Each structure stands twice: as structure tokens, then as C-alpha cells.
Amino acid sequence: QVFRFYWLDAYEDQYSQPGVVYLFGKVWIESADAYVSCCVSVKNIERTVYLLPRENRVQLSTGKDTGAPVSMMHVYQEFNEAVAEKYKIMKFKSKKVDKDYAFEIPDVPASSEYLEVRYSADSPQLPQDLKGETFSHVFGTNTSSLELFLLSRKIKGPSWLEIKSPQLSSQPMSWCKVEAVVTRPDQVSVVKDLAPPPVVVLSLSMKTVQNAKTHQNEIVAIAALVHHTFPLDKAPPQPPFQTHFCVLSKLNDCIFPYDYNEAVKQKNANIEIALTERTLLGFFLAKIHKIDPDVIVGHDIYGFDLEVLLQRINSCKVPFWSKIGRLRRSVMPKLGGRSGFAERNAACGRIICDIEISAKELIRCKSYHLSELVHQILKAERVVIPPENIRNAYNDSVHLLYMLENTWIDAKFILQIMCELNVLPLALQITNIAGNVMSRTLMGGRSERNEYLLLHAFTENNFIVPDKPVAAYAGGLVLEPKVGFYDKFILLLDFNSLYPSIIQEYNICFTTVHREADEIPELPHSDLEMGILPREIRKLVERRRHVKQLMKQPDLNPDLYLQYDIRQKALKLTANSMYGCLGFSYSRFYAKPLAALVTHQGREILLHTKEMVQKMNLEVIYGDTDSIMINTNCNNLEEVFKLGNRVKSEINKSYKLLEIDIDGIFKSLLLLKKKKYAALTVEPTGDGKYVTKQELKGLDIVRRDWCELAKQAGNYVISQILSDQPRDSIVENIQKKLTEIGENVTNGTVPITQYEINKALTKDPQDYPDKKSLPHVHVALWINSQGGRKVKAGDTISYVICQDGSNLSASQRAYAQEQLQKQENLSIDTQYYLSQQVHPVVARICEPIDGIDSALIAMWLGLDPSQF
DNA sequence: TGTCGCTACAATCG
DNA sequence: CGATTGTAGC
Ligand SMILES: Nc1nc2c(ncn2[C@H]2C[C@H](O)[C@@H](COP(=O)(O)OP(=O)(O)OP(=O)(O)O)O2)c(=O)[nH]1
Ligand SMILES: [Mg+2]
Numbered sequence: 001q002v003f004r005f006y007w008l009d010a011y012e013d014q015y016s017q018p019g020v021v022y023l024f025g026k027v028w029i030e031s032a033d034a035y036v037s038c039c040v041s042v043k044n045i046e047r048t049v050y051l052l053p054r055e056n057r058v059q060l061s062t063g064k065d066t067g068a069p070v071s072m073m074h075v076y077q078e079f080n081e082a083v084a085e086k087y088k089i090m091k092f093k094s095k096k097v098d099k100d101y102a103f104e105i106p107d108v109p110a111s112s113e114y115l116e117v118r119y120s121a122d123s124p125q126l127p128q129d130l131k132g133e134t135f136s137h138v139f140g141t142n143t144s145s146l147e148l149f150l151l152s153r154k155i156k157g158p159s160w161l162e163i164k165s166p167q168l169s170s171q172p173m174s175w176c177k178v179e180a181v182v183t184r185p186d187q188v189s190v191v192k193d194l195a196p197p198p199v200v201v202l203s204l205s206m207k208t209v210q211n212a213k214t215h216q217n218e219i220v221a222i223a224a225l226v227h228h229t230f231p232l233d234k235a236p237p238q239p240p241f242q243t244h245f246c247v248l249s250k251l252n253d254c255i256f257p258y259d260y261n262e263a264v265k266q267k268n269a270n271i272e273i274a275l276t277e278r279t280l281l282g283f284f285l286a287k288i289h290k291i292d293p294d295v296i297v298g299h300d301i302y303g304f305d306l307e308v309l310l311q312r313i314n315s316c317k318v319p320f321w322s323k324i325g326r327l328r329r330s331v332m333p334k335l336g337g338r339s340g341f342a343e344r345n346a347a348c349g350r351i352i353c354d355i356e357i358s359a360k361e362l363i364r365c366k367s368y369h370l371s372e373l374v375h376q377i378l379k380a381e382r383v384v385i386p387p388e389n390i391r392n393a394y395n396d397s398v399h400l401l402y403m404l405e406n407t408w409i410d411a412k413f414i415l416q417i418m419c420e421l422n423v424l425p426l427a428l429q430i431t432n433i434a435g436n437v438m439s440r441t442l443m444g445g446r447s448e449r450n451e452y453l454l455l456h457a458f459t460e461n462n463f464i465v466p467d468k469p470v471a472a473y474a475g476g477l478v479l480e481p482k483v484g485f486y487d488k489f490i491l492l493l494d495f496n497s498l499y500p501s502i503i504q505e506y507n508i509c510f511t512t513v514h515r516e517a518d519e520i521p522e523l524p525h526s527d528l529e530m531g532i533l534p535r536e537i538r539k540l541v542e543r544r545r546h547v548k549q550l551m552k553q554p555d556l557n558p559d560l561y562l563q564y565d566i567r568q569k570a571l572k573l574t575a576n577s578m579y580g581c582l583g584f585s586y587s588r589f590y591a592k593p594l595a596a597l598v599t600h601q602g603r604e605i606l607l608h609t610k611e612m613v614q615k616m617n618l619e620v621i622y623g624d625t626d627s628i629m630i631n632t633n634c635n636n637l638e639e640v641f642k643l644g645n646r647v648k649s650e651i652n653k654s655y656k657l658l659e660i661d662i663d664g665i666f667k668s669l670l671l672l673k674k675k676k677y678a679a680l681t682v683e684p685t686g687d688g689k690y691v692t693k694q695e696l697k698g699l700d701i702v703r704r705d706w707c708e709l710a711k712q713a714g715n716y717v718i719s720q721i722l723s724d725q726p727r728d729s730i731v732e733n734i735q736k737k738l739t740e741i742g743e744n745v746t747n748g749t750v751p752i753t754q755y756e757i758n759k760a761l762t763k764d765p766q767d768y769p770d771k772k773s774l775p776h777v778h779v780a781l782w783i784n785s786q787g788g789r790k791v792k793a794g795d796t797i798s799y800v801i802c803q804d805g806s807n808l809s810a811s812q813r814a815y816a817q818e819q820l821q822k823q824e825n826l827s828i829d830t831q832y833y834l835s836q837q838v839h840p841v842v843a844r845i846c847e848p849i850d851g852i853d854s855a856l857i858a859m860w861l862g863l864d865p866s867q868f
Numbered sequence: 869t870g871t872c873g874c875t876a877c878a879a880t881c882g
Numbered sequence: 883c884g885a886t887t888g889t890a891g892c
Contacts, residue, residue: 341869446872475874476892498892499873573872576892580872587872595873625875625892674876675891698877698890705878705889759888772881774887811880840878 003027003163003180005038006197007155008294009439011327011348012146019045019121021146023161024326024349026197026294027178034228035197037292039174039326039349040163042182045145047121050099050114050464051075051135058133070134072096075115078134087126092119101464102511104590108137110511114464121145128467139464146437147468150452151459153188156435158232158428160191174349175289175326196428198229202293203241203418205411206305207403209251209390210787216315217308217789218277220390222247222284223407225415226291232428236419241412245270245287248404249280254394263397271404278316281309289323297353297418299370299410302340302443303792310335310346325349344439351427355414357444358423360794362566366704366758367796374413377420382413387788422563426570433540433574446577451588453578457532466588473518473583473596476625477603478674479610484848485721486621486669488633489640490679493648494663495605495626497544497572499579500537502601505657508594509533515593520600537578544571602626605658609651616647622671627663629671637682637690640665667692668722672699672844678718694722700841704758704796709750710837713741717845731851734842735860741838742862745830752817755828756798757837763793775799775814782816801833802826810836834861839868 007025021042026035053075057066068074076094084092097116101108115135130138140148155161164187166180173179182188207221225241246269250256256273257263264271274280288296298305306324313321314332322329326349333342344352356368365376374382385393385406393399418424423442431438436452458465495501502508509531512524551564581587583595606623613620613628622629630647632640644662651660666679676698684690696702701714716737720730744750759776765784768777779799783791791797799814804825806813810832820826839857846852858868 337869339869339871443870445870447870450872471874473874478875478892577872580874583873584871586870599874627892676877700878700890703878703889762887771886774880776888809880836879 001165003040003166004160004191005040005163006035006158006160007040008158008199009349009351010146010150010437011345012144014144019043019047019145021045021149022174022327022349024174024176024294025158025161026199028197029178036177037294037326038178038180039176040161040166040180040182040188041169041173042149042185042188044183045121045149045185046093046118047123047125047143047145048116048118048140048148049126050097050116050139051079052108052112052114052137052139053135054133060131060133072113072115075134078132079115079117082132083126083130087124089119089123092117098462099464100462100511103466104515104517105137105466106517114139128470139467142467142470144468147455149185149188150435151455151465152185153190154456154460155188155190156456157431157433158196158438159432160194162189162191163187164189173328175323175328176292176349196232198231199294199424200226200228200291201230201295201297201415201418201424202226202288202291203297203411203415204301204305205298205407205414206308207385207390207407208308208789209387211252212787216311218251219280219308219312220249220251220277221404221407222280223404223411224284224287225408225411226293227415228291230295230424232424234425236422240415240419243270244408244411245272246404246408247272247274247280247283247287248400249274249277250394251391257395257397257400260397260400263401267401276316277312278318281313281316281318284309285313285318285320285323289320292326293350295351295353295424296347297355297414299355299373299414301352301354302343302357303354304789306340306343306347306352307335310343321346340443344443351439351442353418353423353427353442355417355421355423358421358427358442359417361444362421362423362426362570367798369796370410370413372796373417377417378413380413382410420559421566426567429567430570430574433543446573447581447584447587449574450578450581453536454533454589457536461532463532468588469586472585472592473599474603475599477606477623478625479606479620479623479628481671481674481677482621483671483673486631486666486671488631488635489637489682490621490666490669491630491632491640491644491647492663492666493609493628493630493644493651493660496659496661497541497575498602498605498626498658499598500541500575501658502598502605503537503579504530504534504541505655506597506601507531507534508597508601510589510591510594513591513594513597515591518596519593520596521593523597523601533578537575540571540575540578544568544575547571608654609660612651612654613647616650618643618647622677624675629669637665637684637688664695666695670718670721670845670848672847678722680722694719700844704760706841707757707833707837708754709741709745709833710841712754713738713838714841714845717842721845721849727851731849734846734852735856738838738842738857738860739862742834742860745834745838746862748828748830752800752820752828755800755833756817757800758796758798760796761791761793765791773812775801775811778812778814779816782819801829803829831863834863835868839863843868 005025005027007023009024012021023040027038029036053070057068094117097114099114100111126141128141169179204224206219208217208219210217223246225244227242325347333345371382374380393403427442431441434449434453435456455465507524511531512528513521515521547568582591619631634640648660665682667682668680670678678696680692681695682690700706701711720733765780776797779797780791801810801813802815802820842857843854854868855865858865
């Protein structure tokens with residue numbers, strides 16, 4: 001009678017169906033010898049409200065204090081007589097519950113007795129500010145049914161569920177294979193210690209041609225790859241895809257090439273030529289229904305792909321739109337709007353993975369468009385078809401098949417990127433750690449994950465969680481650096497998980513820090529038991545430590561090593577975001593005093609460590625909120641390591657959980673400013689043999705907002721400065737290289753690609769005020785004017801500052817590279833680069849170096865020394 | 869409909 | 883000078 005299934009996504013419609021949540025997942029059907037998508041409707045999720053009684057009765061209007069003691073009997077009588085009649089609530093179940101509370105609502109005791117009241121989700125919702133003669137507050141009035149279910153049944157991310165006495169639906173309500181109705185949340189349980197089942201992953205790439213008549217994007221191809229047994233706890237399979245399907249349509253006026261049919265048949269692929277976009281969309285929807293993918297992946301799926309798909313479905317009136325998801329509906333959610341919430345609801349029951357968001361979360365790249373990710377992750381080159389060539393492709397079989405195969409290659413690259421970053425396993429792991437829904441986790445962001453983590457933690461410890469909400473304080477301390485060049489050994493000491501460690505050691509928690517509704521609250525007494533937040537953050541830190549230790553295993557596959565590094569960084573960021581969300585104004589758990597206390601203790605710790613190291617008769621030259629740089633004044637590495645161990649032990653002696661470890665040994669250092677230095681990190685090889693690896697932090701060479709020519713010049717200069725060559729030879733080599741680069745720029749022998757400057761966007765190009773014209777925004781608008789996919793917020797734009805004869809400011813002469821390659825009146829501003837891209841960077845680098853100055857750099861580049 | 873924290877340098881505009 | 887926008891660093 002039981003019903004065991006693995007739930008992946010949950011969908012709730014607060015308005016359409018009240019108190020009903022649909023869970024989509026996998027169920028093993030023995031006859032089919034495979035898992036099949038199943039949908040479970042958990043109905044009758046009653047809404048719970050906790051009432052906090054007063055100590056004495058109070059007149060509602062007079063604001064008096066009668067003095068009659070208030071017991072739960074009076075609270076129940078009041079709710080039965082006044083509130084129930086006033087708000088039209090017919091049936092409700094009331095019980096007395098002892099619950100704890102430590103959050104930001106004044107006059108709420110730490111522990112007290114509450115009157116938990118439950119009634120049907122169809123009944124009206126009580127106001128958030130409800131008060132009465134017998135109670136001073138009502139909680140959980142606006143709690144979502146999904147949240148109530150998840151916290152009541154202690155479901156934490158995807159996992160196996162056991163359903164008791166399931167019933168069958170009168171008529172189908174989902175596009176899945178198996179359906180079941182649960183009449184009460186009590187019938188759903190969690191079963192642990194079982195492997196996740198393989199899921200279906202469908203990677204789709206589409207090619208569209210815009211109609212300038214109506215500025216609407218029409219789809220002309222959809223190449224999709226599917227794998228039916230993609231694991232969620234193992235390595236990605238090779239090849240990542242099992243089968244595929246391609247659909248190719250024609251425009252409104254154009255016609256197919258002469259022998260398109262014969263060439264397509266000879267191609268031997270699952271190509272379906274759809275006469276009209278209506279048929280193409282119908283075929284795609286039928287294919288999605290047949291495959292029933294659980295994880296649909298793509299690039300810009302949330303911003304471009306799904307929005308275009310739904311818009312064209314609406315325009316062409318393709319009947320069964322809801323097949324894009326897993327529920328049966330009739331009215332499509334309104335498109336547009338911020339985020340992909342409309343798209344997510346349209347694809348309800350299917351986990352949408354946007355490798356753009358995932359890549360932004362996991363790795364750092366100069367640009368996040370598909371070509372850059374392909375070049376960086378897969379080390380492959382992607383061929384991009386201009387939209388004009390897509391329009392002109394419908395004139396010969398060869399070009400049309402090339403376009404379709406390019407769409408296929410884009411889909412394959414998307415799947416390869418998803419597998420390489422290990423996005424799905426990481427999403428599953430983080431969702432299990434946090435306890436929220438997987439789709440939200442893959443949507444990006446750290447606030448919701450931490451919010452659900454703390455919801456689960458506090459709920460399990462008999463706490464009333466706060467209702468969902470309907471440079472403020474000082475931060476880390478950066479020591480003043482001793483700018484210069486150090487050719488001896490610099491020893492870097494860095495704390496491990498400094499803020500998590502502070503929270504653990506000093507017992508900083510909602511239940512221990514006595515706040516008051518900008519003064520730093522006092523530290524909690526050492527007698528108190530560990531709070532909820534220290535426990536959760538300790539678990540996170542321990543998981544990260546386990547991953548790091550697993551990384552140290554010798555003879556590890558480099559790809560597996562990089563995956564472990566990404567996982568460790570993700571766990572570090574999860575703990576740090578747990579810290580940060582204390583200082584988030586819109587967060588559910590805003591506890592600014594706690595964040596201020598954490599940062600204040602961090603500053604105190606750094607100051608104390610600096611004082612200790614200085615008291616050891618050692619030189620301290622830098623430090624950023626958890627670290628110290630020490631000038632050992634030694635040339636032997638063994639002594640450096642011995643001193644590092646000694647000082648680390650001495651510092652650690654003063655703490656219970658905080659630990660200081662040797663971050664790295666720099667053979668040479670070039671400390672320029674705060675958060676700006678270059679070093680030759682030393683990684684010993686064995687038997688006294690060490691290998692030196694360069695390391696730049698914060699310099700302009702490691703910023704996407706500088707031309708690659710400037711980056712190359714600065715890298716060469718830094719390499720020379722950090723080398724062991726005599727100083728005179730270093731200066732001579734710098735002069736020679738600068739002269740060569742000046743000659744190359746003057747003679748136009750530099751590649752054009754080296755002139756690009758990359759700047760991202762924060763708002764849409766339209767939303768930028770008329771603050772003159774920031775270069776990138778300028779080019780951004782041009783890109784939108786032309787007939788191509790638009791550039792939205794958070795999109796990198798590469799522009800080249802070029803001469804146009806305008807006698808205008810450089811910032812107002814920014815142009816796209818294609819513009820330069822096309823127009824005959826635009827030329828690269830050689831002087832601009834030699835004077836404001838190469839000279840500034842090298843001049844900043846060579847400030848602490850004797851023999852090089854701004855005038856000399858200007859002279860060597862062929863420029864005029866006067867102005868500089 | 870969501871949206872982690874703060875410190876610091878840098879180029880540009882008013 | 884101060885304000886903005888952007889990109890690093892913890
Ligand atoms: N809120 C927030 N705080 C951060 C972030 N990055 C660093 N911090 C803060 C909190 C960290 O405890 C502190 C020290 O920076 P680190 O980069 O050295 O990280 P941490 O020491 O926590 O760990 P680790 O050195 O990798 O063992 O800086 C972040 O992304 N968000
Ligand atoms: Mg650290």
C-alpha cells in the first residue's frame with residue numbers, strides 16, 4: 001500500500017489551489033524496468049498560527065491592564081468568540097504548545113506558551129498585526145503551504161519519500177506517468193540511506209531570426225540532446241548524451257533549398273522539417289512530453305530561450321502549452337517581469353539549469369557568454385553564425401545543414417559545460433545541505449539557501465521562526481602595507497574560516513547575544529550552551545574541511561581536483577553567506593548587531609595577532625581581515641618553514657577553535673597598495689627542491705577592464721621585477737619591451753583582439769540615465785539597435801576606443817569591434833592606448849622600483865614625456 | 869518576483 | 883572635491 005518515490009521539485013499556487021502542493025519525482029515501475037516521472041498532490045495542508053498570550057488582560061481601545069490573569073483558556077475563548085466570528089472561520093483545532101523565540105520582535109519572551117491554531121487553507125488569512133485582549137501577537141499568518149509542508153515533514157532537498165495509503169486522481173492532473181493524491185501531510189515521510197535515482201537531462205539550443213517588422217524573435221531550429229540515465233551522485237557519463245532530436249522550420253516568406261529533403265535524409269539524423277513555426281513548436285512540445293525531461297539545461301534559458309518559446313507559443317496559438325511543464329493548466333502566466341519566475345512557473349516540475357548562472361556562481365571568467373565559457377572550460381573554439389548568415393542560410397542545402405549542425409554543437413557544448421562544472425551534483429548537495437527546492441538553488445542566490453537552512457534548524461529545536469518579510473556597520477581591518485619590493489622570503493599566515501570560527505568559538509547566535517531594538521552587543525557568557533547558528537556553521541565548516549582533506553590525496557585526477565576545489569569554494573561561500581545574511585536588510589534573519597559583533601571580533605583578532613607577531617621581533621608588512629605577511633629576512637627555506645610553524649603555534653595557543661595556517665611562502669613580493677601585490681609563491685617539490693609559481697592579487701593585470709596589450713606589458717614587467725636578474729638588466733629589458741610595444745602599436749602590427757576592453761552591465765541599456773555615456777553602455781545600445789540577440793543586465797561588452805574625427809572625449813568614442821572592421825572612417829586610437837592603457841598600468845607597477853618612472857615610461861613608449 | 873556582508877582602488881563627470 | 887560605476891579583495 002506504500003508508495004516510494006524520489007521527489008525533485010515542488011510547485012504551489014497560492015491563489016488557484018489553496019493548501020495544495022505538487023511534488024514531481026521518480027518512481028520505479030518494475031514492469032517497465034526503469035524509473036517514470038510521478039506527481040503527488042499533498043492536499044489539505046492546514047495553516048498554523050501561534051498566539052502569544054498576555055500576562056494580564058488588556059482593554060482593546062482603552063489600552064488598560066485589568067489584572068485578571070490570562071491562561072490559555074481565555075485565549076481559546078477569545079479566539080472562539082471574537083476572532084472566529086469576525087474573520088469567518090468555521091472549524092479550527094486548538095492546542096497549547098510550549099515554543100521558544102529569539103528574534104527581532106519586542107516584548108516576546110524567550111520561552112512561553114502559545115495556542116497553536118490550525119484551519120483550512122481555504123479560510124481567510126488573519127492579519128499580521130492581529131491583537132486582542134488576551135494575546136499580543138499572532139505568528140505564521142502568511143506562511144506558504146509549501147514551507148509549512150517542508151518544515152512539518154522535515155523534508156530537506158531531494159530525497160526518497162514514503163507515502164501511506166495513496167489515492168488515485170479522478171481525472172488526470174499532470175503530464176507525468178503516475179499520479180497519487182495525499183489527503184493529509186501526515187502521510188508523507190522521509191526514508192534515508194538510499195542512492196538517488198538517475199534523472200533525464202535534456203539540453204536544448206535554438207536558433208532564431210528576428211522580425212524587424214514587429215521586433216519579435218521567431219524560432220527556426222531547436223537542436224536538443226537527451227540522456228535518460230544521468231547520475232546525480234557519480235561522475236558525468238561519457239558521452240554525456242544518449243540520443244537527440246532536431247527540428248528545422250522555414251521563415252514566413254522564404255522557401256527551403258532545392259534538395260533540402262534529400263540532403264536531410266542523407267544526413268541520417270533525427271531531423272524533422274516543420275513547414276511552419278506552429279508545427280515546429282508542436283513537435284518540440286510533443287518531444288518534451290515524450291522524453292519528460294527532469295532537468296532541462298541551456299544557456300540563457302531563463303532570460304531568452306524559455307521566454308521566446310512561450311511568446312511564440314502564445315502568438316501562434318499552439319494548443320497544449322502546459323506540456324512544457326508537468327502540470328495541466330489553461331492560462332499561461334504573464335510573461336516579462338524580473339527574474340525567471342514566470343519561466344520557472346511555466347516549466348513547473350522541471351528543473352531548469354542555466355549554465356550562465358551556474359558558471360557565474362562556480363567559476364570566474366572575463367565573459368559569461370557561451371563562446372567564452374566554451375573556450376575557458378572545454379578549451380574548444382565555437383563558431384558563431386551572424387544573424388544575417390542565418391537569414392541567408394535558406395538558399396542552399398550545405399549552409400542550412402551547417403546551421404542545424406551548429407545548433408547541435410551548441411547544445412553539445414552546453415551539456416559538456418554542465419558536466420564539467422558538475423552543476424547537477426553540486427546543486428543536489430547544496431540543496432540537501434540547505435533544505436530548499438532544487439530549482440530555486442539552481443536559480444542562483446545565497447539568501448534563500450541560508451534562510452531555509454535556518455528555518456530547518458530552528459524548527460527542529462522548538463523555535464517560532466519569524467514571518468517571511470513582505471556600509472551599515474564596520475567590516476574587516478586592512479593593515480597599512482609597507483609598499484616596496486622584497487627579494488627575501490615573505491611568509492603568509494591566514495586564518496581558516498575566520499568568521500565561521502568566530503561564531504563557533506564566541507557562541508554568537510540569536511539565542512545568546514542579548515541585542516536591543518549602532519552599538520556592538522556584548523559577547524555571550526561562556527557558560528551558555530552552543531546555539532543553533534554555531535551548530536549549523538560548524539557542520540558547514542566540517543564538510544568543507546572533509547572535502548579539503550580529500551583533496552590532499554596523492555595521485556588525483558586533475559579534473560577531479562578542480563571539481564573538489566569548486567565544491568570547497570562553494571561550501572566556503574555558503575558559510576560566508578550564512579554570516580553575511582545576518583547583515584542583509586531584506587533577509588528573514590536580519591540581525592545586524594550579530595554581524596557587527598562578528599566583524600568587531602575579527603578586527604580585534606587581527607589586531608591581537610599583529611601585536612603578537614610584532615612582539616616576537618618579526619616584521620609585519622600587510623594583512624587583510626584575517627592574514628599577516630611577515631618579512632623573514634632569510635634566504636633558506638627550511639628556516640622559513642620552521643619559523644612559520646613556531647609563529648603559527650604561538651598564535652593558535654590563544655584560541656580554542658581558531659587556527660592559523662601557512663597560506664604560502666613568497667620568494668619575492670611587490671607590495672603596491674592595499675589588496676594589490678604580486679609574488680612568486682613557493683610550493684616545495686621535495687629534498688629541498690621547490691617550484692616557484694607566479695601569483696597576482698588585485699593588480700590591473702587581473703582585471704577585465706583593461707586592454708590585453710596593457711595586461712601583457714604589465715605581466716612582462718612584473719615577471720622581470722620578480723626575477724633574480726640584476727636590477728640594471730631588469731630595467732634594460734623593461735625599456736626594450738616598452739619600446740617594442742610602442743613600435744608595434746605605432747605600426748599597427750598588434751592584433752585587433754588585444755584592444756578589447758570588457759565592462760559588464762548592471763541595468764538594461766535603456767535604464768541607464770543620461771549620465772553622458774559610459775563607454776560600454778554606449779556600445780550596448782548599438783548592439784540592441786542592430787538585428788541580434790539583445791544585451792541585458794549583467795552582460796559583458798567588449799569595446800574598442802577608436803578615432804572617428806569627432807574631437808570628442810575618449811569615453812564617447814567607444815565602438816564595437818565589428819563597427820571598426822566595417823566602417824572605413826574608424827581607426828584605433830594608438831595614442832589613447834599608449835598613454836592611458838599601457839602607461840598607467842606599467843607606471844603603477846614600477847612605482848616602488850628605482851630606475852623607472854612615469855616620464856621614462858612615456859619616453860620609451862614613443863610618447864611625449866611632457867604631459868606625463 | 870528576489871536581491872549575502874564590507875573595504876579599497878580607479879577612471880570619469882559635475 | 884564629492885558622487886558614480888565597476889571590479890577587485892577579504
Ligand atoms: N559575507 C562574506 N564574507 C566574506 C566573503 N569572503 C570573505 N569573507 C569574509 C569572511 C571570512 O571569514 C573572512 C576571511 O576571508 P578568507 O577569504 O581568508 O576566508 P576564510 O578565512 O573564512 O576561509 P579560508 O581562508 O579559505 O580557510 O572574510 C564573502 O564572499 N562573503
Ligand atoms: Mg582565511
